[PDB]
Amino acid sequence: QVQLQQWGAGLLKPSETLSLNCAVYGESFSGYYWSWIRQPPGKGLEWIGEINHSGSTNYNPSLKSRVTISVDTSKNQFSLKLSSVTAADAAIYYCARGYADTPVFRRYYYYGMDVWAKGTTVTVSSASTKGPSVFPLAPTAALGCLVKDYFPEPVTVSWNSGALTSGVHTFPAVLQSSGLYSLSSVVTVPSSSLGTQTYICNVNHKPSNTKVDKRVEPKS
Amino acid sequence: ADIVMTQSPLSLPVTLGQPASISCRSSQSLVHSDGNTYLNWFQQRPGQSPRRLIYKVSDRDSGVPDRFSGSGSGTDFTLKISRVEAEDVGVYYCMQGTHWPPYTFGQGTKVEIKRTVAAPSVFIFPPSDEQLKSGTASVVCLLNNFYPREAKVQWKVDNALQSGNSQESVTEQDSKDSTYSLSSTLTLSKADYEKHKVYACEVTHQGLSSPVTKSFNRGEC
């Protein structure tokens, strides 16, 4: 069974060149095309291009001017470069084994986008790393924590150091116009316990070494 | 020009143990000159890569459960699940490999669990004093554990309808109760925030006979 291993930098800034690579293990490097495909946030799949061991290529016409796909047969590896990136290029990128590269094998052999690597999430932004601010959402009652203005993903949120899990909803981050992310984590709790139970959200943002515990209680 | 692949429906509520089917239509014939019809079906889960399930219309990939089957011809195709299991939720794509470059995909069909209608519990949260003294106000409206997913949230500030200044986020369907939750965030400058009194979040949902409203008055509790 063909396995694919994928690596490359997923965080970059506008105008820079995206550079991803994949390595093939488990079967021959010959006989099929090796391809790149992407998936923009909350949208479908877009085939980018392909190459085979002999270096013949096919490219998506909408991207041909900015895409270069290359191969290195001695290591059984192939690569993608996408220049002048912009926000529109933001997506999860996958390398994948395509179709057989000759007509007779293409007609009878099962190959065709049947093996996929793990995806690399690509973000294209001018933003610099910034830890989040954590604000309370004061109070079946509901309460939570607003985790605002951080970069890049991800943050993690727990409640009472993991001891509270039931009824927790931690929402997907939205990317704000400032280019920074924001999210809320909420939990529903019995109103009768509000005065005798302590609720703390634990917020971690690794790139900025941010570790915040914010206690959330009723106001005045 | 690209071959346009059109899937329907966009979202399919399914019932465990019952059949499901989804449609894929191409803008022109997928019959290749070599006689094959290169139409593939994929399943994708959140956080995971696409997994090919069916190829050349009806060939089933190795290790793929036989409750999946593919059929159709020319420009009209169908993926069928004979008896839906919980792990079959996710997004399904079709893909044509007859005309290239480029290969092209459908825009996906979301498969989710059907359940009885459930109205959202609605909560509104005023900005914190901490946030306010930093020059910005975030007002948050929460819709908790509702179904179906469709819901409308409108912000009214002193009865003036807002638009362009809020953002929503929605959780994945709950694995245990099959509901969704939703948060809507209204963002205002501290200045604009203090120019008004009544902050209200109005929720429309199938489970609510009439729109439910939650509000607060700035500076009062």
CATH code of B161's domain: 2.60.40.10
Same domain? For A120 and A135 the reply is no
Contact B194/A at CB under 8 A: no
Method used to solve the structure: X-ray
Q: Beta-carbon neighbour count of residue B119 at 10 Å?
A: 18
Same domain? For A192 and A107 the reply is no
**Domain's final residue, options A126, A148, A171:** A126
Domain count, chain B: 2
Same domain? For A122 and A200 the reply is no
Same domain? For A116 and A186 the reply is no
Cis previous bond, B101, omega within 30: yes
Same domain? For A55 and A142 the reply is no
Same domain? For A99 and A57 the reply is yes
**Domain's final residue, options A77, A103, A126:** A126
Query: How far is residue A197 from each of residues A141, A142, A159, A164, A189, measured CA to CA in Å?
Result: 12, 13, 12, 11, 10
Rounded-to-integer distance, Cα A161 and Cα A157, Å: 9
**Domain's final residue, options A100, A126, A152:** A126
Task: Return contacts of B173-177, CB within 8 angstroms, 24+ apart.
Answer: B173/B89, B173/B112, B173/B113, B173/B149, B174/B145, B175/B86, B177/B115, B177/B145
Cα-Cα end-to-end distance for chain B: 61
Query: How far is residue A21 from each of residues A57, A68, A85, B101, B103, measured CA to CA in Å?
Result: 16, 12, 17, 21, 21
Same domain? For B97 and B137 the reply is no
Same domain? For A90 and A189 the reply is no
Phi first, then psi, for residue A29 (nearest 5°) are -75, -10
CB contact under 8 A, A47 and B101: yes
Same domain? For A132 and A119 the reply is no
Contact B51/A at CB under 8 A: yes
Contact B87/A at CB under 8 A: no
Using a CB-CB cut-off of 8 Å, the residues of chain A touching B130 are 135-136
Same domain? For A134 and A122 the reply is no
Among all chains, which residue has been given the structure tokens 């490097």?
Answer: A29
Longest Cα pair distance anywhere in chain A, in angstroms? 77
Determine the 3-state secondary structure of A88 from DSSP: helix
Rounded-to-integer distance, Cα A13 and Cα A179, Å: 12
CB contact under 8 A, B169 and A174: yes
Among all chains, which residue has been given the structure tokens 């920074």?
Answer: A180
CB contact under 8 A, B171 and A61: no
Same domain? For B195 and B219 the reply is yes
- CA-nearest of A206, A216, A218, A215 to A132 is A206
Q: Please enumerate in sequence order all residues whose Cβ is within 8 A of that of B211, keeping only pairs 6 or more positions apart, or say none.
A: B202, B203, B204
Rounded-to-integer distance, Cα A159 and Cα A185, Å: 9
- CA-nearest of B59, B64, B21 to B37 is B59
Question: Which chain A residue's Cα is nearest to B138?
Answer: A146
Determine the 3-state secondary structure of B57 from DSSP: coil
Determine the 3-state secondary structure of B178 from DSSP: coil
Torsion over CA: B100, B101, B107, B112 (sign): positive
- State the burial class of residue B38 (Cβ atoms within 10 Å of its Cβ: 0-12, 13-18, 19+): buried
Domain extent for A32: 1-126
Q: Beta-carbon neighbour count of residue A202 at 10 Å?
A: 18
Same domain? For B101 and B174 the reply is no
Cis previous bond, B148, omega within 30: yes
Residues A3-38 as b or e (16 or more Cβ within 10 Å = b): ebebebebebeeeeebebbbbbeeeebeebbbbbbb
Rounded-to-integer distance, Cα B174 and Cα B181, Å: 9
Domain count, chain A: 2
CB contact under 8 A, A136 and B130: yes
Domain extent for B208: 115-221
C-alpha dihedral (B170, B175, B177, B179), degrees to nearest 10: 20
Same domain? For B77 and B105 the reply is yes
**What length does chain A have?**
220
